[PDB]
């Protein structure tokens, strides 16, 4: 029989770096958003319903 | 004497005790082709369980696992075997005018105020000390 | 070992559970549990069907443990499961005091002792009182 279809899960690995002289924004300002958006919101008590997008993918 | 003749009530208690003899359930998969009085038969099995069995009910059981499973039911649970549900108290009542006994005894038509039936009459037997 | 006699024949099958129960004022019982094999076909696939068909309701059932008599009663309540490829049957057997339990009788017993009421009352099934 068919019981249930598990939800599609996406795996993805990133890297941040700020000491090369093109990179001037400190990576804590860029990680203060990933740590915030991938956690429970203070308003409602739930995750944030993310949406990942790429230019032609 | 519960009824006029005790043939039917003697057949009826013997039949309601037969239904406790064979009882169980057949878990099928998903059909509305069965009813609580269908009397289906088991044929292709071994010598233990082959024969016609009369159903008692169907259960549908929709859920996420197992899909849809129309469970069949065989047999009836138990029985009290009373002729009528017993009242074992003493009650008081008033005598109700006069009405002759259609059952040709000498029964005196009374009321019972435990019932809220002021219109309907109940024939009752009279107990005397001596009678003879 | 443990030998299940039913109706006088020693009835070679496979018991997966045996439990003999015996209390102080109650009818002693004995649950069996068998397994009817289905996956080994051939001559011994219908010859095991012949051995379970001898288990009619009300038969002499005898259990023997290490060449001593264990239970020795009549059979009641043969349940069979048949889930998937499993096909088990479950037996129960009750003592000779089962003949006394569900039939409403009426007697009077005038001018009798405590024992002569009761040894003549157990005698209707064949139970022999010792007192």
Task: Provide a compact summary of the structure.
The structure is cut from a larger assembly and holds 1 copy of chain A (57 residues) and 2 copies of chain B. Chain A has 57 residues and is mostly helical.
Structure, explained:
The structure is cut from a larger assembly and holds 1 copy of chain A (57 residues) and 2 copies of chain B. Chain A has 57 residues and is an all-alpha fold. Helix content of chain A is 19%, strand content 0%. Chain A is flat and about 60 Å long. Chain B is mainly beta and 132 residues long. Chain B is 9% helix and 19% strand. In chain B, the strands form 3 sheets. Chain B has a 3-stranded antiparallel beta sheet with strand order 1-5-4, with no helix packed on it. In chain B, strand 2 and strand 3 (51-53) form a beta hairpin. Chain B is elongated and about 70 Å long. Chain B starts with 6 loop residues before the first helix and ends in an 8-residue tail after the last strand. Chains in contact: A-B, B-C. Chains B and C meet through loops of B and helix 2 of C. Chain A: This is Afp7. Chain A: Keywords: Plasmid. Chain A: It comes from Serratia entomophila. Chain B: It comes from Serratia entomophila. Chain B: This is Afp8. It is classed as virus like particle.
């Amino acid at each position: 029989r068919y019981v249930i279809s598990e939800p599609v899960g996406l795996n993805l690995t990133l890297l941040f770096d700020s000491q090369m002289p093109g990179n001037t924004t400190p990576i804590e300002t860029q990680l203060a958003m990933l740590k915030s958006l991938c956690a429970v919101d203070a308003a409602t008590g739930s995750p944030y319903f993310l949406r990942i997008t790429w230019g032609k993918m | 004497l519960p009824e006029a003749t005790l043939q039917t009530l003697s057949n009826s208690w013997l039949n309601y005790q037969q239904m406790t003899g064979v009882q169980g359930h057949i878990v099928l998969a998903g059909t509305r082709d069965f009813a609580p009085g269908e009397s289906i038969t088991l044929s292709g099995f071994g010598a233990g369980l082959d024969g016609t069995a009369m159903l008692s009910g169907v259960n549908q059981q929709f859920d996420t696992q197992y899909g849809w499973r129309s469970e069949l039911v065989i047999g009836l649970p138990a029985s009290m075997l009373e002729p009528a549900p017993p009242v074992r108290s003493l009650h008081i009542g008033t005598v109700a005018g006069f009405t002759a006994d259609p059952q040709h005894l000498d029964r005196i038509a009374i009321h019972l105020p435990a019932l809220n039936l002021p219109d309907s009459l109940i024939f009752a037997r009279l107990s005397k000390p001596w009678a003879s | 070992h443990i030998t299940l006699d039913i109706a006088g024949q020693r009835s070679t099958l496979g018991i997966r559970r045996l439990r003999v129960q015996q209390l102080i004022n109650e009818i002693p019982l004995a649950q069996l549990e068998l397994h009817i094999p289905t996956d080994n076909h051939g001559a011994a696939d219908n010859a095991v069907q012949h051995e379970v068909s001898r288990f009619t309701l009300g038969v002499r059932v005898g259990i023997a443990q290490d060449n001593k008599p264990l239970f020795d009663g009549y059979l009641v309540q043969k349940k069979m499961q048949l889930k998937g490829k499993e096909w088990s049957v479950r037996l129960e057997a009750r003592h000779a005091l089962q003949k006394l339990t569900f039939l409403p009788h009426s007697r009077v017993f005038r001018q009798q002792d405590d024992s002569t009421v009761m040894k003549g009352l157990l005698q209707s099934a064949g139970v022999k009182l010792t007192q």
